[PDB]
Design an enzyme around this catalytic site. Structure first.
Site, PDB file in Angstrom:
ATOM      1  NE  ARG A   1      36.321 -13.284 -25.579  1.00 16.49           N
ATOM      2  CZ  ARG A   1      37.058 -12.574 -24.729  1.00 16.49           C
ATOM      3  NH1 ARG A   1      38.354 -12.411 -24.946  1.00 16.49           N
ATOM      4  NH2 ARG A   1      36.494 -12.037 -23.644  1.00 16.49           N
TER       5      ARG A   1
ATOM      6  CE1 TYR B   1      37.260  -8.396 -25.008  1.00 20.61           C
ATOM      7  CE2 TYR B   1      38.155  -6.162 -24.735  1.00 20.61           C
ATOM      8  CZ  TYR B   1      37.781  -7.393 -24.201  1.00 20.61           C
ATOM      9  OH  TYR B   1      37.902  -7.607 -22.857  1.00 20.61           O
TER      10      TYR B   1
ATOM     11  CG  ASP C   1      28.468 -10.492 -23.159  1.00 19.71           C
ATOM     12  OD1 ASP C   1      28.398  -9.947 -22.053  1.00 19.71           O
ATOM     13  OD2 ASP C   1      29.559 -10.636 -23.745  1.00 19.71           O
TER      14      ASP C   1
ATOM     15  CG  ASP D   1      44.104  -9.480 -19.574  1.00 18.28           C
ATOM     16  OD1 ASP D   1      43.754  -9.305 -20.760  1.00 18.28           O
ATOM     17  OD2 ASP D   1      43.745 -10.462 -18.888  1.00 18.28           O
ATOM     18  NE  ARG D   2      45.059  -6.394 -14.208  1.00 13.78           N
ATOM     19  CZ  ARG D   2      44.441  -7.566 -14.348  1.00 13.78           C
ATOM     20  NH1 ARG D   2      43.666  -7.801 -15.397  1.00 13.78           N
ATOM     21  NH2 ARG D   2      44.598  -8.511 -13.436  1.00 13.78           N
TER      22      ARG D   2
ATOM     23  NE  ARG E   1      33.392  -8.758 -20.308  1.00  9.16           N
ATOM     24  CZ  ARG E   1      34.581  -9.282 -20.612  1.00  9.16           C
ATOM     25  NH1 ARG E   1      35.302  -8.757 -21.602  1.00  9.16           N
ATOM     26  NH2 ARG E   1      35.050 -10.341 -19.953  1.00  9.16           N
TER      27      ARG E   1
ATOM     28  CD  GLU F   1      36.079  -5.123 -21.824  1.00  8.54           C
ATOM     29  OE1 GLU F   1      35.246  -5.877 -22.363  1.00  8.54           O
ATOM     30  OE2 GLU F   1      37.256  -5.461 -21.623  1.00  8.54           O
TER      31      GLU F   1
HETATM   32  C1  LIG Z   1      41.667  -4.200 -17.362  1.00  9.44           C
HETATM   33  C2  LIG Z   1      41.622  -5.601 -17.925  1.00  9.44           C
HETATM   34  O1  LIG Z   1      42.411  -6.459 -17.531  1.00  9.44           O
HETATM   35  N1  LIG Z   1      40.691  -5.841 -18.841  1.00  9.44           N
HETATM   36  C3  LIG Z   1      40.559  -7.167 -19.472  1.00  9.44           C
HETATM   37  C4  LIG Z   1      39.081  -7.662 -19.368  1.00  9.44           C
HETATM   38  C5  LIG Z   1      38.594  -7.870 -17.879  1.00  9.44           C
HETATM   39  O2  LIG Z   1      39.399  -8.918 -17.283  1.00  9.44           O
HETATM   40  C6  LIG Z   1      37.115  -8.292 -17.886  1.00  9.44           C
HETATM   41  O3  LIG Z   1      36.347  -7.289 -18.473  1.00  9.44           O
HETATM   42  C7  LIG Z   1      36.566  -8.587 -16.479  1.00  9.44           C
HETATM   43  O4  LIG Z   1      36.665  -7.485 -15.610  1.00  9.44           O
HETATM   44  O5  LIG Z   1      38.936  -8.965 -20.052  1.00  9.44           O
HETATM   45  C8  LIG Z   1      39.518  -9.162 -21.321  1.00  9.44           C
HETATM   46  C9  LIG Z   1      39.043 -10.233 -22.074  1.00  9.44           C
HETATM   47  O6  LIG Z   1      39.662 -10.604 -23.096  1.00  9.44           O
HETATM   48  O7  LIG Z   1      37.988 -10.800 -21.692  1.00  9.44           O
HETATM   49  C10 LIG Z   1      40.548  -8.326 -21.731  1.00  9.44           C
HETATM   50  C11 LIG Z   1      40.954  -7.043 -20.949  1.00  9.44           C
HETATM   51  N2  LIG Z   1      42.410  -6.927 -21.057  1.00  9.44           N
HETATM   52 CA   LIG Z   2      28.190 -11.490 -19.788  1.00  9.60          CA
END
Ligand SMILES: CC(=O)N[C@H]1[C@H]([C@H](O)[C@H](O)CO)OC(C(=O)O)=C[C@@H]1N
Ligand SMILES: [Ca+2]
Ligand SMILES: *[C@@H]1O[C@H](CO)[C@@H](O[C@@H]2O[C@H](CO)[C@@H](O[C@@H]3O[C@H](CO[C@H]4O[C@H](CO)[C@@H](O)[C@H](O)[C@@H]4O)[C@@H](O)[C@H](O[C@H]4O[C@H](CO)[C@@H](O)[C@H](O)[C@@H]4O[C@H]4O[C@H](CO)[C@@H](O)[C@H](O)[C@@H]4O[C@H]4O[C@H](CO)[C@@H](O)[C@H](O)[C@@H]4O)[C@@H]3O)[C@H](O)[C@H]2NC(C)=O)[C@H](O)[C@H]1NC(C)=O
Ligand SMILES: *[C@@H]1O[C@H](CO)[C@@H](O[C@@H]2O[C@H](CO)[C@@H](O[C@@H]3O[C@H](CO[C@H]4O[C@H](CO)[C@@H](O)[C@H](O)[C@@H]4O)[C@@H](O)[C@H](O[C@H]4O[C@H](CO)[C@@H](O)[C@H](O)[C@@H]4O[C@H]4O[C@H](CO)[C@@H](O)[C@H](O)[C@@H]4O[C@H]4O[C@H](CO)[C@@H](O)[C@H](O)[C@@H]4O)[C@@H]3O)[C@H](O)[C@H]2NC(C)=O)[C@H](O)[C@H]1NC(C)=O
Ligand SMILES: *[C@@H]1O[C@H](CO)[C@@H](O[C@@H]2O[C@H](CO)[C@@H](O[C@@H]3O[C@H](CO[C@H]4O[C@H](CO)[C@@H](O)[C@H](O)[C@@H]4O)[C@@H](O)[C@H](O[C@H]4O[C@H](CO)[C@@H](O)[C@H](O)[C@@H]4O[C@H]4O[C@H](CO)[C@@H](O)[C@H](O)[C@@H]4O[C@H]4O[C@H](CO)[C@@H](O)[C@H](O)[C@@H]4O)[C@@H]3O)[C@H](O)[C@H]2NC(C)=O)[C@H](O)[C@H]1NC(C)=O
Ligand SMILES: *[C@@H]1O[C@H](CO)[C@@H](O[C@@H]2O[C@H](CO)[C@@H](O[C@@H]3O[C@H](CO[C@H]4O[C@H](CO)[C@@H](O)[C@H](O)[C@@H]4O)[C@@H](O)[C@H](O[C@H]4O[C@H](CO)[C@@H](O)[C@H](O)[C@@H]4O[C@H]4O[C@H](CO)[C@@H](O)[C@H](O)[C@@H]4O[C@H]4O[C@H](CO)[C@@H](O)[C@H](O)[C@@H]4O)[C@@H]3O)[C@H](O)[C@H]2NC(C)=O)[C@H](O)[C@H]1NC(C)=O
Ligand SMILES: *[C@@H]1O[C@H](CO)[C@@H](O[C@@H]2O[C@H](CO)[C@@H](O)[C@H](O)[C@H]2NC(C)=O)[C@H](O)[C@H]1NC(C)=O
Ligand SMILES: *[C@@H]1O[C@H](CO)[C@@H](O[C@@H]2O[C@H](CO)[C@@H](O)[C@H](O)[C@H]2NC(C)=O)[C@H](O)[C@H]1NC(C)=O
Ligand SMILES: CC(=O)N[C@H]1[C@H]([C@H](O)[C@H](O)CO)OC(C(=O)O)=C[C@@H]1N
Ligand SMILES: CC(=O)N[C@H]1[C@H]([C@H](O)[C@H](O)CO)OC(C(=O)O)=C[C@@H]1N
Ligand SMILES: CC(=O)N[C@H]1[C@H]([C@H](O)[C@H](O)CO)OC(C(=O)O)=C[C@@H]1N
Ligand SMILES: *[C@@H]1O[C@H](CO)[C@@H](O)[C@H](O)[C@H]1NC(C)=O
Ligand SMILES: [Ca+2]
Ligand SMILES: [Ca+2]
Ligand SMILES: [Ca+2]
Ligand SMILES: [Ca+2]
Lengths: 388, 388, 388, 388
Positions: C290, C324, C244, C70-71, C212, C197
């Site tokens: 999903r 998403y 959800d 993710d980051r 969420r 989100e």
């Molecule tokens: C900033 C960040 O890393 N956000 C991620 C998000 C979070 O991990 C999740 O909302 C829990 O905080 O999850 C998901 C996800 O696919 O569930 C994707 C996002 N990239």
């Molecule tokens: Ca939930």
């Protein structure tokens, strides 16, 4: 806005500075670059761009096989941003065909493309990106035109066409267009005996074209046009410094009104700037092939049959491939004079490099400087072996 | 519209926020990204873009072999959209050459490219995308310039050039251009003993350039220019926090008017923002190689020969490759002050990573924040092994 | 011109028509398409575009290996033409980071990107494509935001941020921006127990966000914002139709002011349009993963804890991957009402399809119709086997 | 500016000149060209572009396998610059669907795309690049439309749709749109017994459409529309020169108000220009397959059941593949008349060339000339073997 008028004279050419280079063949070894040939450069009031005849395939593509051929239904005049290579994604098609010319009149651009079989070709004249006029072949033998930009004056843009033999007398015509429409046309006059691929420029309300006498001349024919009176004259560059190719060695005296003998039925598109002492001639270094390229200052070359060089500048080493060359200028630049420019087509592949099945080129372009600048050579830069 | 004037002072730099990053090498592993080096960033009134010297080939292309070399006929200054990589299809050529600078004066942009052999180079100055002035080599030994943006004030855009030795005294000149024309030039003055690749910025009608003393200095020479009077001074950053590379370890006292000794004939393009207590210095973390990158707040670094850091921020870890760095600012942003920005060139390939035959880079760029932001490190991100 | 005001109410949603689809994964199997995730759609007064977080590599590129993460420092918010895929050559970088939001206020666009390590992230707020404001992490635990467009009213563009735990109470803040500057911020209030989100839209001077609750809720939290008073409320969608994922099976009565239990520490970004009887809820068909996507008309879902569907439309079959989903509307369209739209992220690759080493997605988008249109399903369309 | 009005009559067609050609299949052998079919050409007041239904994959891509299929969720109407090929990077999506039409009314463009399963399709009408109106299937059997440009007059743009059987009576409707909204619709009237894929043009306030009678006619049905009264008539081209395909051999007398028998349940989209003696018919040379293409001057073809050719021009040799063909004109060109133009779809791949797993095409386009121009043939130009 208003039609451009050739109100300025040429700037003093003391040397040549690098203007543009696309390194198309180098880059296209690993990117979607179109196969081309017969390139040139032409300016709009707010932009200058590269132009060429695409072969309708990329260099790495399997359809590059056979691109040594000149006239197929897959060719088109394309233009793209200055010094960028002609790619599938950045090339704009101006018209369909295998021989062309193009020029901006100050308001908008006129583009001409000729297409068809050898005995039934036709030119379509585009203005403001729309087809406006069509001209059918008059001699039924490869109707063809400049392969470099035309020049306009108060809306009138003369263009030189040839239809007929490449190895004997042909039928050359000078058409005077305005907004894509034919104002007038006249048959070639003067002492030039054969005319092909004229390279033109304008200054002080006169258009000078240096062309190719494919039939017999190793010196280059010259057509001077009055776009107001819509009349012209023709002769040859008098100077013994011969500029076509192939050609015999340089004599001590040239010919003013007849082709200088020694080589028949062949040549290369070329150019010159004929302005008294401020006269510069371009030519391949080799007298046998399209190898190397140099600029030679030959005072009064046009009228002095004994004129020899007083200064020079090498553009491409004789150990590197050159090809077509032609004139263009940015008629919309600032200043009190028009800065002479030219481009050289650096042909790669067949027939000189036959390990590859294609034929293409890259472009190098220079403009004049009033300074006496140091010189460098500018090769295409690609390694053919990489394409094997 | 009107020429931009440096009417604001620098914003207070309390930290640095991420501004741009193109991940060029990562992306180019599988897309048509041009090989580059010597990048920078420069803004127009309505857009900020990345700039660099292309090598005229893609990274995956076979012609990438040998791109460690600095000056070939296949290089050109290109620009492309902020944070996008320099691709064959989105790169705009500003001019042809292997050393450059560029800047917008508020009305239009001036771009300068130097090309030619070592003993016969020449600079061509472009304005409004047209060639306007040319300057021939004066010392016949690699005429070269900034490799980052110049700065303008009321139409006057000073540029620092050097011609001559990289390992002994050279001939540095400050040219004052306006609309691409030379208003004046002067030889370098002051106590700076060698000058190369100046990184400049402007504020309150003064232009500050932090350069590279390749010959002897591990501290960086500084040129301050008055673009109205068209005069300048030069000295070295006094601070013992040394910022060139390679360099000796940091002493407790630096040198104000002489190069700090320890390393000769080498260096790296770098920069600084010299504004009293709001002074920040950039430098590689390694004293031996172009590794890592950090920003150090060194109050009065320029004038205090004992000045040490009071705050800092890591930009690239010492375990990652860095390279050139330079200054730029968006002089057309809103607000009451100019926000200091910089870029770091992340060099990949040769000579440090010689398993590949090429040398290229990606760009990371930051601007200042008045907040005290958390820090992250920003590596190029590519895996060399993927290119094997 | 002038700041946009939310003066219209929602159009009556009787069905959903296809709006956009980029088939990114299909196309990218053989073209330079960037790996992405967390996409959305957002309109400017004269254009609507696709947005997403690039992973800084193409799908076919070797650097696609590991993009399930993710980051990283290689991510950026990019935008590209509607229904075109996000390619290296057509993607415009809005800012650098791994969490974002963006919206046009009628005059220009504000874009926000958060970057940094988990314990030291920072948001940079861009306005008119220039960085204007920065906000440092307040809870030092993955500062994060919407991942879909924000909404503006008379220049005020509220944005929901969360910093802190994803599995327990966190610190959510609503920031009110105007021209990229902070007018005010407030901590989350109301009965929503966890916020992440948010998917938002505006009508009749009110902004509704469906978010969420990652910690405990299978029903979705809702934040209603007054952009003039710059105040808000929060609650949960009352309806027993849970939206959800993952989530327990649908009960006969939901929860209005507390998370509906059954699933903890997980979820998916989603959305809804809450407008009395004209209420439509989006959700994955699968309660476990999903998978699939459907729109359900649930009159008064927000306030009726026993509300069940009265109409529906399948968007993606349960046999196809979704992901998403979020809201957006073209606030600059003609007519007397705002046409509700949404997008669904169709995730491909890891973790569900682990034969490939990457994770990416394509986009499908719909808008409402007052007609009762026939339905079709809209899968990503790529064959994973082709990538093996 | 103002809505365009069909105030001019057709220019005299004495021959056809080359207008555009993209060589898409040749180029796409080694570049990212999208697979398409059902192409056409359409002009805006300042630009003319190519249009087609993409298959959502490149030709070299593995997803090209199966593109012989007509209606999938991966198709979209795309447009791109004249004579350029439809690439991933230069193609603009107008809307999502597998049947379309598009036309500019002088102020802005209306685009229509139909999508959905066979029994539940719907048309979405876009105006100014925004969705405005939706129409649900009325016969629940492949709602479909023109596959070439519509024509407008004072804001009213009529469009012909068919819903129902392709092998028996169907339900054809003529919708009159203005700014994407439905002004009126009427069921087909007249003697045409089956209508599909109408090819239309306008002159002197009347719109003429030449369509396809898939059910029984080898002669082509014709719909003439009055866009002011919003009424129409229908009949068949009387001439014995049959223009659908496949078709029986040409008889000596045709049928004016009934399908000419001999071939059922099949056909090809085609067109004609019906203007008294200035009447020209297009058709494949082969009576059995989509092979070759020719233009035939057949004076009064529409009304004379014994009319035969008086002149002709070959466009594609019978030894080359053709396909769909349709009409368009640049209603914003200069001059006193509208210049008739048409395009021919050159289908490559399946079913005729089944060594490859895909089906695609390239485009060739011509416009009329008042000159009697020499003719050339214009094949697609690709070598299928290269794709093996
Ligand atoms: C900033 C960040 O890393 N956000 C991620 C998000 C979070 O991990 C999740 O909302 C829990 O905080 O999850 C998901 C996800 O696919 O569930 C994707 C996002 N990239
Ligand atoms: Ca939930
Ligand atoms: C840094 O940069 C600067 C700037 O460029 C460099 O300085 C330049 O140096 C150039 C090379 O020396 C020079 O170019 C030459 O200029 C000559 C003219 O100048 C001389 O003559 C005049 C006349 O009296 C004097 O005033 C002047 O002071 C000089 O003495 C030209 O004559 C040169 O061209 C000829 O030579 C080259 C080979 O070098 C040929 O390729 C070219 O075609 C010319 O020679 C052929 O043609 C003539 C004419 O017919 C024949 O007489 C001759 O025999 C040759 O013919 C054969 O070859 C041709 C071509 O293959 C073939 O067709 C024919 O049949 C025969 O086989 C040359 O142009 C620049 O002027 C000069 N610039 C300046 C501003 O000084 C400097 O060196 C660089 N510094 C460093 C350190 O490198
Ligand atoms: C979340 O983010 C925030 C925001 O970034 C993080 O907080 C930041 O943390 C940074 C690291 O601690 C910090 O940066 C340091 O600041 C020091 C200055 O602050 C300190 O001193 C002043 C002075 O009295 C005090 O007021 C202040 O309170 C602090 O005590 C600098 O001195 C640090 O730089 C030096 O160290 C680094 C190694 O960390 C070197 O790379 C750097 O070059 C400096 O040290 C060299 O140079 C000096 C000067 O000559 C020498 O004295 C020293 O020996 C070193 O010399 C060797 O190394 C160099 C380089 O290789 C070589 O050339 C030389 O020859 C020698 O070999 C450093 O800049 C930020 O200021 C701080 N920001 C804020 C707002 O607080 C926070 O940690 C993050 N949170 C988490 C949880 O991670
Ligand atoms: C041509 O196109 C048209 C236009 O689309 C097609 O017509 C459409 O057809 C759709 C399918 O039949 C239809 O959608 C359904 O509408 C139902 C509501 O309408 C009905 O009820 C009202 C209420 O009294 C009546 O007025 C009306 O006349 C109808 O009878 C919905 O209830 C349907 O949704 C439910 O079913 C689907 C499965 O089909 C589920 O996926 C969905 O989630 C809903 O069911 C779950 O949830 C409820 C609520 O909690 C539970 O009660 C139920 O048990 C299910 O719960 C399980 O599953 C969920 C999801 O997995 C899980 O979370 C839970 O835990 C449980 O396990 C459905 O939306 C359109 O309205 C209709 N449109 C129109 C305009 O008519 C037409 O068919 C097409 N033609 C052809 C020839 O194909
Ligand atoms: C340089 O360029 C110029 C410009 O293009 C070239 O000149 C052109 O030359 C063309 C070929 O000769 C010519 O095209 C033909 O025109 C004929 C009409 O002109 C003649 O008749 C009139 C009528 O009295 C006279 O005034 C005139 O002077 C001519 O004599 C057409 O009739 C020709 O079309 C027919 O032939 C071609 C084959 O060539 C077929 O493909 C076509 O479909 C037509 O024939 C079929 O259809 C008719 C009508 O039903 C039947 O009667 C006939 O039997 C054929 O039917 C079979 O085939 C069809 C199709 O497969 C099938 O459906 C059916 O069932 C049957 O099986 C042809 O169009 C241009 O007009 C002419 N242009 C000019 C300006 O002169 C010049 O040659 C070039 N120069 C060089 C050196 O190459
Ligand atoms: C080039 O020269 C012709 C003058 O012969 C100029 O054409 C006058 O221009 C104005 C402005 O549009 C009109 O009112 C005149 O009628 C024009 N034409 C003629 C033929 O007299 C033209 O303006 C000049 N071009 C430029 C750039 O100055
Ligand atoms: C949105 O609403 C605000 C009114 O509150 C409008 O902002 C008036 O607009 C004119 C025109 O620029 C100015 O003279 C006023 O001072 C504006 N502002 C305020 C705060 O009063 C705005 O015009 C509306 N937007 C639109 C598109 O109508
Ligand atoms: C229209 C046409 O085919 N022109 C060709 C040109 C002619 O063949 C030559 O000028 C003789 O007529 O030659 C050359 C050439 O390289 O010599 C290239 C041009 N493509
Ligand atoms: C014009 C030129 O070649 N400049 C080069 C520069 C010089 O070699 C250096 O500053 C010494 O003069 O070094 C470096 C370098 O990486 O150190 C790169 C530049 N390309
Ligand atoms: C909507 C649709 O599928 N139209 C198709 C069309 C029809 O199948 C045909 O006109 C019969 O209805 O045929 C053809 C065709 O090549 O004959 C192509 C079109 N894609
Ligand atoms: C991807 O990365 C993992 C982890 O480093 C490695 O084990 C795997 O082999 C890689 N897969 C490919 C196709 O490179
Ligand atoms: Ca000759
Ligand atoms: Ca490729
Ligand atoms: Ca040094
Ligand atoms: Ca039929």
């Amino acid at each position: 806005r208003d039609f451009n008028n050739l109100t300025k004279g040429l700037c003093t050419i003391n040397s040549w500075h690098i203007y543009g280079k696309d390194n198309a063949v180098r880059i296209g070894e690993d990117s979607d670059v179109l196969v081309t040939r017969e390139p040139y450069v032409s300016c709009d009031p707010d932009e200058c761009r590269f132009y060429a005849l695409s072969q309708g395939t990329t260099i790495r593509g399997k359809h590059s096989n056979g691109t040594i051929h000149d006239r197929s239904q897959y060719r088109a005049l394309i233009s793209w941003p200055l010094s960028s290579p002609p790619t599938v994604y950045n090339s704009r098609v101006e018209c369909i065909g295998w021989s062309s010319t193009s020029c901006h009149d100050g308001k908008t651009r006129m583009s001409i493309c000729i297409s068809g079989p050898n005995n039934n070709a036709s030119a379509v004249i585009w203005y403001n990106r729309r087809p406006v006029t069509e001209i059918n072949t008059w001699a039924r033998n490869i109707l063809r035109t400049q392969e470099s930009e035309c020049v306009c004056h108060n809306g009138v843009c003369p263009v030189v066409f040839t239809d007929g033999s490449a190895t004997g007398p042909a039928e050359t015509r000078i058409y005077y267009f305005k907004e894509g429409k034919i104002l007038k046309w006249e048959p070639l006059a003067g002492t030039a005996k054969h005319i092909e691929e004229c390279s033109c420029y304008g200054e002080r309300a006169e258009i000078t074209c240096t062309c190719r006498d494919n039939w017999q001349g190793s010196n280059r024919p010259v057509i001077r046009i009055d776009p107001v009176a819509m009349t012209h004259t023709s002769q040859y560059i008098c100077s013994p410094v011969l500029t076509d190719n192939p050609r015999p060695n340089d004599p001590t005296v040239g010919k003013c009104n007849d082709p200088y003998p020694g080589n028949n039925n062949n040549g290369v598109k070329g150019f010159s700037y004929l302005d008294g002492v401020n006269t510069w001639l371009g030519r391949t270094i080799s007298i046998a092939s399209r190898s190397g390229y140099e600029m030679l200052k030959v005072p009064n070359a046009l009228t002095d049959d004994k004129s020899k060089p007083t200064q020079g500048q090498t553009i491409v080493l004789n150990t590197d491939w050159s090809g077509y060359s032609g004139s263009f200028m940015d008629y919309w630049a600032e200043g009190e004079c028009y800065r002479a420019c030219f481009y050289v087509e650096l042909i790669r592949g067949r027939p000189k490099e036959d390990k590859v099945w294609w034929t293409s080129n890259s472009i190098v372009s220079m403009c004049s400087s009033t300074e006496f600048l140091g010189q460098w050579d500018w090769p295409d830069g690609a390694k053919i072996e990489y394409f094997l």
